[PDB]
């Protein structure tokens, strides 16, 4: 209709007028409008059928469909794609019709297919690995959660070894120990670590202000990236602040450090094997950095991780927790759905600012500053000192 | 910000101004805009987390939360709901924060909780049963589909006994036969049958034109509702055309007829046990009516269902197929996701108009008229005659 076409034009123009945070606000508003305007039948159909997207994306990934379509220079028929990818022709046609209906691909007026933005996204290895993680790891845990809670009379989940994960995968191990026995899941996780989120904390972190008159002499450490994965934070730090002296150290387990060597700069960033359940070896660093680490642990274990760092700190040292800080009320779906998932798989939780401060106070830490860098979903670098 | 509030105001006014079909078009446009404006990370987070809605709706149903909240006269704290419903207080608080973020409930400015439109929807028994069906029946089949297809080198699914269902539930039975052996699932399906879709075919079906000079004597049947469930079509027919002569007959299996007695009118509608895989007993009826029946069967079995009716027809008899008629191109998510689901569970498929005509021609039937009654997703009463 002319009205819906005009709605689309105006929302597209408003989205172009603003920045990425304004666009995120607009998208959340579109979701709220959808939910408020759907009929009861629509609500049930949406909940029933939006499930299809993850399974169908998993199939397209298995087939290599999104990568292939992303590199195509002209629209492709369903028969061409089926023959190229080794898929039944009718199966491929039905899959593509569904995918086009949810913009996973685009369907042309002559019933051929081209890449959409979502096609290109699912072709990126790290983002593809995120979707595959949702299918193979998250889905079974969420499928097990309702009956787990029912059988246990709805307990408050507090223990990584006693949550829905153990029911879903028929094991008594916690998720992290179980994963070490699953090579294909490990391989997918290694690809998942190559995804770099944007924006990052350096977009708003006032580094020179927080540094003050800290001296890197004689040979002190500026930045210790604890569980840093591929070291993206270290790389971006050296990129934005190339002249700031001090050691920059990536700490992780040996297999992921080995994976990180391929893309690490030739010099300037150390790779130090370190298990963050053991005392922090680097003494007196300016910043001990924990990005998306503590969210994966219940309070008692997250506390242990902080307690292992505290003895290494001097008066100028800071622990920087870079993580989600959802609000007391009005939290968005992308910071509450995470909470349900990490509850069900890891026994952990999202933490408000007050909850972060309580946890850190148990380690003897005090919040000095908080630097938000995403909106409306809150990710922030929280700077803690001793006392 | 102010912009988001203005978008909501204007879209709400436009939605109020139009009818249900215009609102459905607007909602589809809002979904398309959301998908087109999300970031790559947003896409993966959405696919990862929208899954949570079905699991959390199942938990809320298990707790009786939506029915309870729907009958509350004031906002309720999370502690009050937890204590009343027998749920851990922190678990209840986290569940409610997530539900509020996806409008499954509403959160007030003082962090209490009231019903939303979706709360009320999930409190309705038939719609609740739809959500429970999505969780317990659809989700396992979709979880099994990618590896089923991979192990079988991506076959065209054509057989109700050889699809993802058999892997999901570790059985050689087809879905309907297996479900008949599962009493709790049967009970849920009986509640699901009490949901009546709106609008229905009588909103556009020119009954008097199709009847012509047809005579109901001697004791002939006007309308035979084959697999009619609770008999809603019979009830609405008698309601809209109370003076039209001719028997009106609800045909289904005995347990469903028994369930239907509670809500059936005291006179005017016959309850006749009949299995639609067997020859049709009522001879020379004007309309043999099949609503949302044939979509659940692959072509050879749907053909058998029609062939069991054809010998009962005289020259004035018509078979009326009331079902989805998705377009050749540009089909919507609510008529393609259905296709993927019924492929994976039942071996069946959605059918375009041309595919319906091919199938019916195998039974000796010819399309006379097609009366659409929903938009933009196509449901239509297709009228077939002999020859
Ligand atoms: C969320 S991932 C990567 C987060 C990373 N800081 C980032 O934002 O780029 C968590 C990281 O913690 C690492 N890790 C898990 N257990 C660890 C342990 N016991 N000691 C050190 N690192 C660990 C993983 O190998 C992984 O690289
Ligand atoms: C989609 S449901 C209800 C459809 C119904 N026409 C309506 O629109 O409400 C399918 C119906 O077919 C019935 N059914 C399933 N197998 C049947 C059979 N073999 N013979 C007769 N009815 C059957 C079920 O009991 C159910 O009522
Ligand atoms: C976008 S990739 C991260 C997504 O997967 C979920 N997730 C990530 N890592 C884990 C993990 N180790 N265990 C359980 N869920 C996870 C998070 O809720 C998020 O939605
Ligand atoms: C509102 S319920 C409609 C849903 O029922 C689903 N469905 C799949 N198999 C069956 C079945 N055997 N019985 C009833 N509904 C089913 C379809 O996928 C559709 O999304």
Residue numbers in the entry:
A (entry chain A), B (entry chain B): 1 to 387
From the paper:
Recently, the novel multifunctional S-adenosyl-1-methionine (SAM)-dependent enzyme LepI, located in the PKS-NRPS gene cluster for leporin biosynthesis, was characterized in Aspergillus flavus. LepI is considered as a SAM-dependent methyltransferase that can catalyze stereoselective dehydration via three pericyclic transformational processes: intramolecular Diels-Alder and hetero-Diels-Alder reactions and a retro-Claisen rearrangement. The overall structure was found to be largely similar to that of SAM-dependent enzymes,28–31 exhibiting a core α/β fold of alternating β strands (β1–β7) and α helices (α1–α19). This structure exhibiting α helices and β sheets comprises an all-helix amino-terminal domain (NTD), a carboxy-terminal domain including a substrate-binding site, and a SAM-binding site, which is formed by a seven-stranded β sheet rounded with five helices.
